[PDB]
C-alpha cells in the first residue's frame, strides 16, 4: 500500500488505487497489472509483498510524481523563457489552446473580478 513514495488505500481495487499515483491512469494501471500478472478486481489487501515489489518495479519503469512534475514545470518554464505565445498565455494566465477569452475563460482566470 506504499508505492513510489506514497500510500495507497487498501479497500479499493488495484487499478483504482494505482490510479491514485500521479502519472498513471486506467490504461497504464492495466498495463501495470498485466505486466505483474495481477488481476484488476483484487484489492491492495491480500496482496503479497513480492507482488507489490513487482508493482513498484513496473511503476518505476515510467515517469511519476516528482519526475513528472519536474518535467512539466520545465516545459512550462521553457515556454516562459522563450516568450512564445504559449508562454505569454501561461504567464498572463490566459488559455493557451486557442479558446475564447471574451467569455468562459474561468478555469485559467479563476472566479470573477468585479470592476470597481
Amino acid at each position: 500500500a506504499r508505492i513510489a513514495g506514497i500510500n495507497i488505500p487498501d479497500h479499493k481495487h488495484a487499478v483504482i488505487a494505482l490510479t491514485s499515483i500521479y502519472g498513471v491512469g486506467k490504461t497504464r494501471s492495466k498495463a501495470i497489472l498485466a505486466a505483474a500478472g495481477i488481476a484488476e478486481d483484487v484489492k491492495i489487501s491480500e496482496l503479497s509483498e513480492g507482488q507489490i515489489d513487482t508493482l513498484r518495479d513496473e511503476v518505476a519503469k515510467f515517469v511519476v510524481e516528482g519526475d513528472l512534475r519536474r518535467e512539466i514545470s520545465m516545459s512550462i518554464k521553457r515556454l516562459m523563457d522563450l516568450g512564445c505565445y504559449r508562454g505569454l498565455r501561461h504567464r498572463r494566465g490566459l488559455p493557451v489552446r486557442g479558446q475564447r477569452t471574451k467569455t468562459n475563460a474561468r478555469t485559467r482566470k479563476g472566479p470573477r473580478k468585479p470592476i470597481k
Partner: protein, 177 residues
C-alpha cells in the same frame, strides 16, 4: 551504537587524515540532536499540542518537553507562558540510534527526495533541517494519524568550522546533494 562504533573506528581515522589534526580530541563529534515541533495552533485546542507530543514520543522514545513562550507577542496572539511547542533533546545511544533510523529509513521515505542542503550549517558546523511530514517515520501509523505535523531536526556537533561538520556528516554519508 552501530554508528558510534563506526565513528570511533573509521570516521576518526578519516578526519585525522583529511585534516592533519595534532590531537584526536581535536576531531569533531556529534553532541546532541534537538527535535522541535513549533505548534502555534494550540491556542485553538490543547489536544493538538497533546497529540503532537505523542507523535514525537514515538519517533524518539522520549517524553517531549513542552516548550512555552519566552515573551508575549500580539502578531501571533500569544502571551508569555503559553505552551507553544515541544522539543526533544537526544544524546548518547538514543541519539545515535535515531540518527541511524533517520538517514537509513526516514530520508528515503521523503516524497520526491533529492538531497539535503549544504547551506544549512549556521556558520559553526551545527546542521539544521526541517521535515515536511511526520509519516516518513514508520513509528507513526498512517490510518491512526489525522494531522500532518512537521518538525525540525538540529544536529549540534563540536565542529568549529562549517566544513568540518560537512565532512563529518559526509563521513556518515549524509545525503547533502
Amino acid at each position: 551504537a552501530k554508528l558510534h562504533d563506526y565513528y570511533k573506528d573509521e570516521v576518526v581515522k578519516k578526519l585525522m587524515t583529511e585534516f592533519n589534526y595534532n590531537s584526536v580530541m581535536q576531531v569533531p563529534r556529534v553532541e546532541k540532536i534537538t527535535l522541535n515541533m513549533g505548534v502555534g495552533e494550540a491556542i485553538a485546542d490543547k489536544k493538538l499540542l497533546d497529540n503532537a507530543a505523542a507523535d514525537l514520543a514515538a519517533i524518539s522514545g522520549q517524553k517531549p518537553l513542552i516548550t512555552k513562550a519566552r515573551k508575549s507577542v500580539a502578531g501571533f496572539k500569544i502571551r508569555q507562558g503559553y505552551p507553544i511547542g515541544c522539543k526533544v533533546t537526544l544524546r548518547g545511544e538514543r541519539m545515535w540510534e535515531f540518527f541511524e533510523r533517520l538517514i537509513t529509513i526516514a530520508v528515503p521515505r521523503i516524497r520526491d527526495f533529492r538531497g539535503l542542503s549544504a547551506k544549512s550549517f549556521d556558520g559553526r558546523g551545527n546542521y539544521s533541517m526541517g521535515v515536511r511530514e511526520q509519516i516518513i517515520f514508520p513509528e507513526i501509523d498512517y490510518d491512526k494519524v489525522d494531522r500532518v505535523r512537521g518538525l525540525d531536526i538540529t544536529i549540534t556537533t563540536t565542529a568549529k568550522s562549517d566544513e568540518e561538520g560537512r565532512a563529518l556528516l559526509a563521513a556518515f554519508d549524509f545525503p547533502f546533494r
